[PDB]
Amino acid sequence: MDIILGIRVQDSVILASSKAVTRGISVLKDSDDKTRQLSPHTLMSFAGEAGDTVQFAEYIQANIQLYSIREDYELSPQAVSSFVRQELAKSIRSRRPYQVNVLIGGYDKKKNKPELYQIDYLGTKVELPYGAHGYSGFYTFSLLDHHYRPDMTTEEGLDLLKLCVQELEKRMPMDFKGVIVKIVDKDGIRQVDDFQAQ
Amino acid sequence: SDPSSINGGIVVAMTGKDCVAIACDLRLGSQSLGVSNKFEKIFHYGHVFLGITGLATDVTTLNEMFRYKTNLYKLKEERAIEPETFTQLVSSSLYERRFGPYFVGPVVAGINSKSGKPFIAGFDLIGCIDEAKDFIVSGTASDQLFGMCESLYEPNLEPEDLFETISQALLNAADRDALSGWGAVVYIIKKDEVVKRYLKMRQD
Amino acid sequence: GSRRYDSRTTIFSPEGRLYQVEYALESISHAGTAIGIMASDGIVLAAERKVTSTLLEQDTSTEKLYKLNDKIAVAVAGLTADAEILINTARIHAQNYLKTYNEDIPVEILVRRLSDIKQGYTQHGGLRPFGVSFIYAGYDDRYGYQLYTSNPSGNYTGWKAISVGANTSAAQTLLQMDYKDDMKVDDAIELALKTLSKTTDSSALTYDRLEFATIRKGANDGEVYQKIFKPQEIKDILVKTGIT
Amino acid sequence: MTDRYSFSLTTFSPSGKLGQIDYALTAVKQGVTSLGIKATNGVVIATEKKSSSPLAMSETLSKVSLLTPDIGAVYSGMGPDYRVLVDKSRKVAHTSYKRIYGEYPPTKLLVSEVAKIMQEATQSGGVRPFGVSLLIAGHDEFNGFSLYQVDPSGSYFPWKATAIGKGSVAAKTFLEKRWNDELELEDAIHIALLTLKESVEGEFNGDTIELAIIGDENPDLLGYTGIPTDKGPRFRKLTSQEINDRLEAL
Amino acid sequence: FRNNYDGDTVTFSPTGRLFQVEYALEAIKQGSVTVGLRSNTHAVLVALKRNADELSSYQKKIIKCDEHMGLSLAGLAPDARVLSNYLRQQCNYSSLVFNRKLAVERAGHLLCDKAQKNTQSYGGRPYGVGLLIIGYDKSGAHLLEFQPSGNVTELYGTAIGARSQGAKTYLERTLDTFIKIDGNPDELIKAGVEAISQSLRDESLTVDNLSIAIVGKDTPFTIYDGEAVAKYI
Amino acid sequence: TTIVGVKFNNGVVIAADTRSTQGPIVADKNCAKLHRISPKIWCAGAGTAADTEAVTQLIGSNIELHSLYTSREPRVVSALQMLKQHLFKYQGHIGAYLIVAGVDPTGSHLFSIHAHGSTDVGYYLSLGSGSLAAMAVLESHWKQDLTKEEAIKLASDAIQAGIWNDLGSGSNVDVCVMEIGKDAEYLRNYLTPNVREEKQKSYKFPRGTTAVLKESIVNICD
Amino acid sequence: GTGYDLSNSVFSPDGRNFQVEYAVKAVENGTTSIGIKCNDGVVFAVEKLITSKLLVPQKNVKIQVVDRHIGCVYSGLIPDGRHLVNRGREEAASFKKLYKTPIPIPAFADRLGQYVQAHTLYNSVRPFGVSTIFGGVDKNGAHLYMLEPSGSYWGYKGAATGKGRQSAKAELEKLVDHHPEGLSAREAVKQAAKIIYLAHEDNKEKDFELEISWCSLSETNGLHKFVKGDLLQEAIDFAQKEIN
Amino acid sequence: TSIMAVTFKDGVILGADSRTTTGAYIANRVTDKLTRVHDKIWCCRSGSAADTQAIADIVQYHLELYTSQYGTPSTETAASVFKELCYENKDNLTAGIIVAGYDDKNKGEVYTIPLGGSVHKLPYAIAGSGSTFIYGYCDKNFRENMSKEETVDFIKHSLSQAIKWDGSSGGVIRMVVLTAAGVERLIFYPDEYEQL
Amino acid sequence: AGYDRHITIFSPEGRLYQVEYAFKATNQTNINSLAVRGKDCTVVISQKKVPDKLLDPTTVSYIFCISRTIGMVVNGPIPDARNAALRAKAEAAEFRYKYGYDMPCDVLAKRMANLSQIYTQRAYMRPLGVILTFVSVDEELGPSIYKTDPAGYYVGYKATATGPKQQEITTNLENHFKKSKIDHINEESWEKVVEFAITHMIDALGTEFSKNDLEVGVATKDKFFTLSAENIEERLVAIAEQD
Amino acid sequence: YNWX
Ligand SMILES: [Mg+2]
Ligand SMILES: [Mg+2]
Ligand SMILES: [Mg+2]
Ligand SMILES: [Mg+2]
Ligand SMILES: [Mg+2]
Ligand SMILES: [Mg+2]
Ligand SMILES: [Mg+2]
């Protein structure tokens, strides 16, 4: 499976995501953005079966952008995620379940606090300081459990992820061609164009 | 592959002297992987408590389901739902899906506001109501829990005492179960008041 | 054939109005008067009962005020039976929202839904509309206290104070008169009463003829408290204001 | 073939009057009288057995029905419409409550469910409202004793007492005078009997009257013993003999 | 009276008529004309085509239903398409499923029953076109007359549409003559036109006006249009 | 599970154990296996605990209505047809093995229903993992024209057969009697031969034994 | 008011159904047809109006069979008869399939009945514009029936319907009065050609074609067959004899 | 299960054993496998109990309704119903049924519908697991037009053998007699049939 | 509005004319009939009038056998009668299949009534112009007689009659019972009871009867049946000795 | 499930 990580600091949420799309025997693309902006202060990353993955994320995007319009307002993350959980939990007993895991992170302009949610293909949701999906967590959690602290500055977080990715690059069978990182804060969403080395 | 065994979890409730108690552990994992240590499994609707072990997505869903159903009940009847009753609600709500069940094991605890006799009950994944006047258990550490309880239990225990009991039962039975533990919470209940204490336990 | 007996309920009058909607508001104007007034710290709903008697039972009654949520309530003017149907679906949609977003429903959203069901019956279906007018009163985090109104046509609009049923223009003028932007709850109450007392088609305003409710966010708490006034609680409030 | 009457038969007249509803209320007026009275520890309902002939057998025509062991109902209007209303009412009592909560529905609710049934007939395509008004009486652990009236419009109200059909106004008046809030069941049966006397044209006895009450639990009518939580039904229809014994105390 | 009994085909008059059906038959009467007639070996269809102006095509009035059966339409063109389609289908089904060429007499039985369902149901509306059908089968040559009422009659020859009654008499006379035209195709066709001309009035028939179809023993039903009919005036 | 039914001179009786189990583990040490269908028609069930209660209530209900609609007491042959066609509808997936008996204006009746929807009738019957043990007893001591008191012992003995010689059954004995002219009696815990001996010690832990971290109160009322 | 005759299922204030009656009229304005029950079978016959000399002789058959032992003839709106026969056929098949034995006449009848009666129950359909005479042979005897648009049907020693209805029933009663013993099918076939010829006078303005059919336990083994060749001319002639 | 139906002068006789097993355990030793679908048309049931009971109940209905509407039903018909149910629902049924009845015009008739859903009319028929063992005896001892007494014997013997050998059979022998004079219930205990 | 007399809706007076008009249709035939209860039986009689001499008399009946135990008599046009018959039978089978025992007469009635009520409330269905009298000998209640009408009313009678001359007969009978004090004839054999019946019909309708004029039906423990022409004669004969 |  692909790599998906998330970490919530004091004033923001950071998401990292492998940049590769492999198929059977070849690596098809070294620059994939496994993420969609749900609403100007909410970002969702995903990992999973081939098509289901994008298909699913784009659907949630629509269904959210639509609400934002109908109401001239932006749903809180605790809400956007809950919606997402219901959509997933709805399909598990469907004819063909969406096989997607998502990490959702946003900034609650109202509570003026950042939030990160992890939900798996079954609709298992849980709020966390940091999280990951698939095998990734297996190498990273220890690191986080160790070097994480709630009052972390954003800069302190990017270093922590770097430390993480480094381990993964060191001990993980498959080459994921690096990651793409994004930060979610009061000012919205921005992509860190410098992570190939920092 | 055993839906009931992916996420992990245990809950137990016991009756006392004009009081009941219910507790659970805080783990949420994926097979061997511990994931969250803040997955409370005890929910309450008014003065009726329900804990649910099993597959996490179902645990959640059901909870949401019972909120909805208990809220409408209150508007329609203008009084808060009672345990004896709620239980029947849970039971009927599970059997409705007899051939494609929610992989869980609810347990209910609370007290009749009118009558005052403490109440607890449990169920299998499809509705069979397990009525017992002493204790109920559920989760990956069921065997264990049964063991702990059946031994340590004694009728008419006072709030300060029953606490210990339930806590040990949980704590100890958890430690013998790989998939459960990582934290624990216990609710002591009384006609007018209810207390919530978290326990200190191994984190392995 | 069957067309013969079809009262074509959703057609347009040569003048561009919807016969049945128009004819419905009339039905409504004959119903007891209900009123809602928005304060800087609460909202009041009050209403007069139609077709009464010395033997009715007020204690266990609820014919014009209903709870839709722990945060939303409505006052009804029109056929009660119709009202209930819409209310039940209304109650359901609230919970469907909660289950879906783990947050209580914004008043406007609920209202728009109800209205849209109404408009439905207005454009297709071939059925009679709901002889009902609603005034909704509720709270939430986006807009705070809000008061709305929906009528058989489906339109809904927002008000700082409004009334429905019998003697609208009458009461509305009274309101446009004594109401002021920075009012307070305890004061609102008085006004509502005064109005009804000046709009009543019957003798004098007695408790048995009323239904009364308020929504407050008491500074000594956090959760918004809805309180349907128990009978004796109505009589009590009546003396103070000076109706005796 | 097939029901093509998918439009309403109850539209609004320009005066804002619902034709078929008012008309239905009229049919009720023309129907035999029936009434009910609430007491502190019980309630009562009654009517007249308008034997449309002295050749029919009165008992086979229960105008008073049991809906759940703690609730009963009666009407004034068109008997048939009442009957099918009872079925539906007894059924929905299960499908929407006992089959989900394992205990019978409280009165307000059941009544409410019935109202819903009648109202739908006041709007659904292809039907005419029901030509009946009903008074339902019952009890439940949390609300105590209650009495309600349900009109064809669908509206329903709780009454300390009331009556309907033919002499309603007359009777209602008789009641407003004799009722109060400190009555034991026996006393109310009295009143009911008098109030009924006034509307009754001819022979007036236990073979021409039908009464029923809602009171103390009746183990002797349960049918089995063992379960203690269920102490027995509170609804009892009075036998012909149980009636006369009281009349003679006029 | 009438606007109280001619509203729908599901309302009988008090005399027992069926106004809608009856109104339907009238569309036929305002439709152009066409004629059919059969010998013991061939069957012909001659149909006069109507134009709206001297600047249009002359609406085709003949439809091939199968290699062995076909018809002429009189009145509402849409309804003809609809009803010929059904026949094409019920014709296909026989060949496919039973490797059997459908019997004209049955073709009628079907059209009849089809039209009927449309004269006993609310909302419906009778078909508004008359039809003449011809075909060569196992029991020989044939010709049928279809009236929207649901009546289908097998005749030796006939015609329908405006002024029809004219030719109808010509044939009524010429019967003994043509019922013996076996083996000679061209003759039968000439005979068809003669009859057609005894119901003319407006102008004389032309190469753009006419349309003819023929079937029989060693001749697959075929649509001769314009250019080809010159040799028949 | 062990359920039995025995017919006697002017009525019928049924009985059952009270052990409910999830595999080899006792789930309920005294669960009720006797179900009331109507006042005088009771049924006993073994198989999937939940299905026995469900198909029993469902029909109980459908029956209760049917009576009101007919102003007549219910008949067993009815509950029986109702139960059987339902079960047969579901190809055997409703694990309900039942013994249904009771009294009605036509007489006394005793029957059995297997989850695939086949029915049987006789003077004594049993079902469950304890079926064999009891049936043995039943084949050893039955005789026609049993009294009320003789029947009970019989049926009581038979369950005891099951209890002692079948791991799948245990605890107490539930009995219900139904006689032609009297009200029916539900005897829950007719026999209690499996009480726990007093425990040897008491584990009342001295207070404070447990390590707590955080402690708070909860808000119930609105 | 009136209007009691514009919609099928409506009851006049005198309990009649007008639309059904008008239907009867459409029948009366139609050709005649009859049936005669005999000692071991039934015979049916009907008039065919030779609208003109272009109709092909012996080709536009009108009588029909159902299954292999039932004959049907009806007067009025031809097509409607066809439709009715169709259902009859489907209904007969459904009987044989599930019970093996070719359907008994009384059964078949009632079957045609309930269908027709059904067309006098809803205003979205019109009653059938034909009366039908049908019957055949079964396990226990011969059976002859007649069904009117109202869906009423009974068993007949003989029956007639159409414009010549009254002449026939006249000649029919004669037969009944004269041969209580019953009649041999051969005799009956002849007599049938009579009753039609005679009854043709009621419409003596146009020429006609005759058509007959029978079902006899001894002349046709029980199956229903038409009359052709030798046997037919025999009766055509026995007719032109007794007229003068 | 061991069942057979035999046609004779006076009418017909159905007989069967009384054992229903679930594997090798005897669930019911007194089972009545001779079921009535009409006053004078009965059937013998072999195969799944449930499948059979159900099929039978559905035929009693179809016939009761037939009656009301068209009088007393023929046997050929009673069979047709069965055939229809069995043939039409073959994938979900395991029931082999023998229908026997008595008419005033047709005397006695026997039809047998085997697992496939075919219907066969014949002088006699046997079925049930226990029947494998008597195709011999039966084809050998059966004579057309026997007497009641003679037939009860033939049946009594044939089946006693079947019971002897097949463990899926036993209990008691049941017979039912269908004739003008009525319907008779015959029963035979072990102590009699075993030593013959 | 002014169409309120065409469909089953309310007239401003609270009446459903359509129901009322049907009640008049029930008399279109001009046939009376009645029924009475015995000690252990129940009997019904109806006039058999066959005008047209061209009808196979054996097929003219307004009496139907519903179930082995239930018998029904009909006053109304024939087509609407047979309809009701079929459904009665169908409902009778279903009841047995689904519930196990034979459908009680009082029950069959209620079901039929409920069906009628439906036509009273749904504008697509017209009521049927028929009054139905159901009879049998319930294994529980005894000989029974229940009736239903287009209004959807159903009730059980100690005895009853129907047709144009309803009242004549009802009054006649009303007297007999006021005279004897009991709810049923007091004769053991069903044969005398059939007698009593025909007697009273004459004693009120003042007309004499022959065999081809009456139609009769009886009910007994576990069976019901109609009498053959001849069976009746044995009755008509036996009466010409009291009068 | 439970047995039961
Ligand atoms: Mg477990
Ligand atoms: Mg552990
Ligand atoms: Mg054991
Ligand atoms: Mg006539
Ligand atoms: Mg053996
Ligand atoms: Mg109607
Ligand atoms: Mg209509």
mmCIF file with all atom_site columns, C-alpha atoms in Angstrom, chain D residues 1-2 4-5, chain G residues 122-125:
data_model
loop_
_atom_site.group_PDB
_atom_site.id
_atom_site.type_symbol
_atom_site.label_atom_id
_atom_site.label_alt_id
_atom_site.label_comp_id
_atom_site.label_asym_id
_atom_site.label_entity_id
_atom_site.label_seq_id
_atom_site.pdbx_PDB_ins_code
_atom_site.Cartn_x
_atom_site.Cartn_y
_atom_site.Cartn_z
_atom_site.occupancy
_atom_site.B_iso_or_equiv
_atom_site.pdbx_formal_charge
_atom_site.auth_seq_id
_atom_site.auth_comp_id
_atom_site.auth_asym_id
_atom_site.auth_atom_id
_atom_site.pdbx_PDB_model_num
ATOM 1 C CA . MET D 1 1   ? -58.560 -0.821 -14.253 1.00 0.00 ? 1   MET D CA 1
ATOM 2 C CA . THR D 1 2   ? -56.554 0.391  -11.225 1.00 0.00 ? 2   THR D CA 1
ATOM 3 C CA . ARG D 1 4   ? -56.621 6.359  -10.906 1.00 0.00 ? 4   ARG D CA 1
ATOM 4 C CA . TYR D 1 5   ? -58.192 8.544  -8.223  1.00 0.00 ? 5   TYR D CA 1
ATOM 5 C CA . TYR G 2 122 ? -64.760 0.903  -12.354 1.00 0.00 ? 122 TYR G CA 1
ATOM 6 C CA . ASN G 2 123 ? -65.380 4.065  -14.410 1.00 0.00 ? 123 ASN G CA 1
ATOM 7 C CA . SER G 2 124 ? -62.155 3.653  -16.269 1.00 0.00 ? 124 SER G CA 1
ATOM 8 C CA . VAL G 2 125 ? -63.630 0.964  -18.543 1.00 0.00 ? 125 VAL G CA 1
#
